Coordinates of C-alpha atoms in Angstrom, one line a residue:
Chain L
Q162 CA 0.0 0.0 0.0
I163 CA 2.9 2.4 0.8
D164 CA 4.4 1.7 -2.5
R165 CA 1.2 2.7 -4.2
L166 CA 1.0 6.0 -2.3
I167 CA 4.6 6.7 -3.0
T168 CA 4.3 6.2 -6.7
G169 CA 1.2 8.4 -6.9
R170 CA 2.6 11.3 -4.9
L171 CA 5.9 11.2 -6.8
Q172 CA 4.1 11.4 -10.1
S173 CA 2.0 14.4 -8.9
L174 CA 5.2 16.2 -7.8
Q175 CA 7.0 15.5 -11.0
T176 CA 4.1 16.9 -13.0
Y177 CA 4.1 20.1 -10.8
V178 CA 7.8 20.6 -11.5
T179 CA 7.4 20.2 -15.2
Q180 CA 4.7 22.8 -15.3
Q181 CA 6.9 25.2 -13.3
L182 CA 9.8 24.8 -15.7
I183 CA 7.6 25.7 -18.7
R184 CA 6.0 28.7 -17.1
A185 CA 9.5 29.9 -16.0
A186 CA 10.7 29.7 -19.6
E187 CA 7.8 31.9 -20.7
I188 CA 8.5 34.4 -17.9
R189 CA 12.1 34.5 -19.0
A190 CA 11.1 35.4 -22.5
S191 CA 8.9 38.2 -21.1
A192 CA 11.8 39.5 -18.9
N193 CA 14.1 39.6 -22.0
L194 CA 11.6 41.8 -23.8
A195 CA 11.2 44.1 -20.8
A196 CA 15.0 44.5 -20.7
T197 CA 15.1 45.4 -24.4
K198 CA 12.4 48.0 -23.9
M199 CA 14.1 49.6 -21.0
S200 CA 17.4 49.7 -22.8
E201 CA 16.1 51.1 -26.1
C202 CA 13.2 53.3 -25.1
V203 CA 14.2 54.7 -21.7
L204 CA 18.0 55.1 -22.0
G205 CA 17.6 56.6 -25.5
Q206 CA 15.0 57.2 -28.3
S207 CA 13.8 54.3 -30.4
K208 CA 12.8 55.0 -33.9
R209 CA 11.2 51.7 -34.9
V210 CA 7.5 52.0 -35.2
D211 CA 4.9 50.7 -32.7
Chain W
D73 CA -19.1 5.4 -20.5
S74 CA -17.7 2.9 -18.0
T75 CA -19.0 3.4 -14.5
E76 CA -16.4 1.2 -12.8
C77 CA -13.6 2.8 -14.7
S78 CA -14.9 6.2 -13.5
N79 CA -15.2 5.1 -9.9
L80 CA -11.5 4.0 -9.9
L81 CA -10.4 7.1 -11.8
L82 CA -11.8 9.4 -9.1
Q83 CA -9.3 7.9 -6.7
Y84 CA -6.3 9.4 -8.6
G85 CA -7.1 13.0 -7.7
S86 CA -7.5 16.0 -10.0
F87 CA -5.3 14.9 -12.9
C88 CA -8.2 15.0 -15.4
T89 CA -9.1 18.6 -14.4
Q90 CA -5.5 19.8 -14.6
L91 CA -5.1 18.3 -18.1
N92 CA -8.4 19.8 -19.4
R93 CA -7.4 23.2 -18.0
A94 CA -4.0 23.1 -19.8
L95 CA -5.6 22.3 -23.2
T96 CA -8.2 25.1 -22.7
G97 CA -5.3 27.5 -22.1
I98 CA -3.4 26.6 -25.3
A99 CA -6.7 26.7 -27.2
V100 CA -7.4 30.3 -26.1
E101 CA -3.8 31.3 -26.7
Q102 CA -4.2 30.4 -30.4
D103 CA -7.0 33.0 -30.8
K104 CA -4.9 35.5 -29.0
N105 CA -2.0 35.0 -31.4
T106 CA -4.2 35.5 -34.5
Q107 CA -5.7 38.6 -32.9
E108 CA -2.4 40.2 -32.1
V109 CA -0.7 39.5 -35.4
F110 CA -3.5 40.6 -37.7
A111 CA -5.8 43.1 -35.8
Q112 CA -3.2 45.9 -35.9
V113 CA -5.5 48.5 -37.7
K114 CA -8.5 50.2 -36.3
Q115 CA -10.5 50.9 -39.5
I116 CA -11.2 49.0 -42.6
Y117 CA -9.9 51.2 -45.4
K118 CA -11.3 50.8 -48.9
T119 CA -9.4 50.7 -52.2
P120 CA -9.9 53.8 -54.4
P121 CA -11.8 52.7 -57.5

């Protein structure tokens, strides 16, 4: 019975971690864009449209 | 449509819900992508004859 509970809980935890990794990657992409905007639009004057 | 298979499935927690939610998220993201790429203009201009 313990083996059954362990396998189940372990799988639920591994699923959680996977989702966190994917979400973190998307946040990283957002942060990179934010860094570019700060660099080009605040510390200077961007000319590219929109 | 298997009653017993359901009964047993309910003992594994909320896996089913979490999966369904993830697929709903990607599905609404696709409509967001098409909206952001194309709907960049406010008016529908017409071609001069």
